[PDB]
Amino acid sequence: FVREHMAHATRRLVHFYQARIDPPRTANEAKHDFSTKEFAKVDNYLLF
Amino acid sequence: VIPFHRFYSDPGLAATANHDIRVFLNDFPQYQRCDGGFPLSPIFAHEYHHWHRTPFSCYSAACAHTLESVLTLAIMHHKMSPVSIAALSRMGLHPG
Amino acid sequence: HHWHRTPFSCYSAACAHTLESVLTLAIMHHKMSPVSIAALSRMGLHPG
Amino acid sequence: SDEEMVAQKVYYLCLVPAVLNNHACGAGLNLKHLLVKLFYTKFFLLTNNPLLAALVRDVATDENVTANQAAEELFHLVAHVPE
Amino acid sequence: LELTKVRAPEGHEATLQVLRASLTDHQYPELFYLIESLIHGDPAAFETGIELVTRCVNNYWRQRGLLAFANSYDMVRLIATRLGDGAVVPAAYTHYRNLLSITRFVARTCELTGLNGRLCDEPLLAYVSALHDPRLWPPFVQALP
Amino acid sequence: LELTKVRAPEGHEATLQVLRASLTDHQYPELFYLIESLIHGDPAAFETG
Amino acid sequence: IELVTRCVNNYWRQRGLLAFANSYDMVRLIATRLGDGAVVPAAYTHYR
Amino acid sequence: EEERRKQFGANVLNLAPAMVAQPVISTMIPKYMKMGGHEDKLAYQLDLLRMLSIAKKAT
Numbered sequence: 055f056v057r058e059h060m061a062h063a064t065r066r067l068v069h070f071y072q073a074r075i076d077p078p079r080t081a082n083e084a085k086h087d088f089s090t091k092e093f094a095k096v097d098n099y100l101l102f
Numbered sequence: 103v104i105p106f107h108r109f110y111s112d113p114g115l116a117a118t119a120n121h122d123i124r125v126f127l128n129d130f131p132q133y134q135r136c137d138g139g140f141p142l143s144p145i146f147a148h149e150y151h152h153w154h155r156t157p158f159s160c161y162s163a164a165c166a167h168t169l170e171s172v173l174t175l176a177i178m179h180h181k182m183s184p185v186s187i188a189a190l191s192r193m194g195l196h197p198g
Numbered sequence: 199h200h201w202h203r204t205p206f207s208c209y210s211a212a213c214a215h216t217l218e219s220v221l222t223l224a225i226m227h228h229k230m231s232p233v234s235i236a237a238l239s240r241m242g243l244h245p246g
Numbered sequence: 247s248d249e250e251m252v253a254q255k256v257y258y259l260c261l262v263p264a265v266l267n268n269h270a271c272g273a274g275l276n277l278k279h280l281l282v283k284l285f286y287t288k289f290f291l292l293t294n295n296p297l298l299a300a301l302v303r304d305v306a307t308d309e310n311v312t313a314n315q316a317a318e319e320l321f322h323l324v325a326h327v328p329e
Numbered sequence: 330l331e332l333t334k335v336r337a338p339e340g341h342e343a344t345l346q347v348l349r350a351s352l353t354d355h356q357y358p359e360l361f362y363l364i365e366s367l368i369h370g371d372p373a374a375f376e377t378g379i380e381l382v383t384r385c386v387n388n389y390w391r392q393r394g395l396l397a398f399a400n401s402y403d404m405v406r407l408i409a410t411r412l413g414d415g416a417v418v419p420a421a422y423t424h425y426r427n428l429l430s431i432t433r434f435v436a437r438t439c440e441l442t443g444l445n446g447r448l449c450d451e452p453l454l455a456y457v458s459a460l461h462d463p464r465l466w467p468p469f470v471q472a473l474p
Numbered sequence: 475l476e477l478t479k480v481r482a483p484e485g486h487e488a489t490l491q492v493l494r495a496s497l498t499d500h501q502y503p504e505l506f507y508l509i510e511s512l513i514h515g516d517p518a519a520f521e522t523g
Numbered sequence: 524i525e526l527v528t529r530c531v532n533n534y535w536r537q538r539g540l541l542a543f544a545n546s547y548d549m550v551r552l553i554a555t556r557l558g559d560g561a562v563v564p565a566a567y568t569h570y571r
Numbered sequence: 572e573e574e575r576r577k578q579f580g581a582n583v584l585n586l587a588p589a590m591v592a593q594p595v596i597s598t599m600i601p602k603y604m605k606m607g608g609h610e611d612k613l614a615y616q617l618d619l620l621r622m623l624s625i626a627k628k629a630t
Contacts, residue, residue: 063104068120071122074126076126083160089241131447131452132447134249138445167336210268219264221330221435223264224435228457228458243441252440255460261435269352270400281617281620282616323374355555356556356558377630426499
């Protein structure tokens, strides 16, 4: 959702690591984590 | 350091480039990994808006090199257009 | 109270060379944690 | 670092003992008593030291870098000796 | 291995045979043991004693094909990071770099494919594989982690 | 691949092993990183280089 | 040493078969001695 | 002051006295005067040869 109004990302990029806290990965690497059969099991919370 | 793309972030590489990333991995060694999967900056946080989605990188991080991954990434770059499936099954190439 | 036990040393004494024992000591050092069994069976790698 | 410690543990716990078939034993020199014989060969501004002139000339040698010339570099590296 | 399906290292069999031979040779020298325990894994020691360690490795490889400073990960790591510019050791440096690459590839299989996530204290690989928690220690510490 | 049946490269995987080494190297030297980002892909910039 | 090791190098340079191989004590002394500046460079493969 | 220069060079460091011929061994002796622990006669030896190692270098 953020546009951030890109000016000098080469210096405004390390500021996110100046921040110490990381957002959750938003379902994509979890969709990679859950193996192919467990993606179809009830173990998968991202069935929906 | 510029970890601008999801293909193009590397934990130890970005840490030894700028040690703020080394402080980030001091905090969070869960990404300090070849697969990794960094939260990857509000700038270019647009993973869904990216053309290259997550399983490209999370395939390449465990891909098998030498003439098959080089070409199968380009086969993973087949479009999912309706006309792409059309020409694809038309030439008999099995879609995804 | 040692971390490594007699099966580690007594495998390494009778081991075979050429990266087989090198990688299999690394896989012998998977944990018997419950969360290790959880993540391991969701990898599909066999718990020991 | 974390990758450093993971790599050191992988090396010293998987790669080394599988190579050696546990022909290993972890030793360390008696460096305080050892370097006394290294010290005061003649002066500076050599190579009459027994068992320095043996091993240095026996292995670490060159036509450029002789017994004395190679013992010079180890005389430089005396400084940072740890416990 | 079939979880990984990665092909990073190249000359692994000849590399581990050169390591085996260096750690089989009966008169692997006192001087090499001295310099390795003396440099003690310090890069600020290695960078001061380059022209001894590099010339000594190179003359030892020229003497006999098995390489030098092999038993210490810190010695082979500093030899990896600095040896080679100027071609000090032309060919056995491939075996040195392959020792480093074997450590990296076995660490990848240690880390596997697709165990992300962390508990509030520790990452998940610390819980899953015992190489990744710092609770396990290297048996030869030269700089404390 | 089998719709095409083309075999244009022949030292392909050896070249990719050399590529693996070249883009692996921890001691991949420094003037390389200077010159490549300097030249930035131009024959007019490159003919002086 | 100046006799026996120069004799090993001379005899391997003469004939490709090696030297002092009748005795375990002699082959033990060769395989232990070599490493003193590589007197016998490539036949120490066969001795070790 | 030459008395302590005799004492540390002769009784502690155990050398025949040529203290002033080398400059860097001369400067460590007033520091070794102030330091105790003379029972361990090897530490000053090893503590001085690392300074002699510093005194010539090309790094």
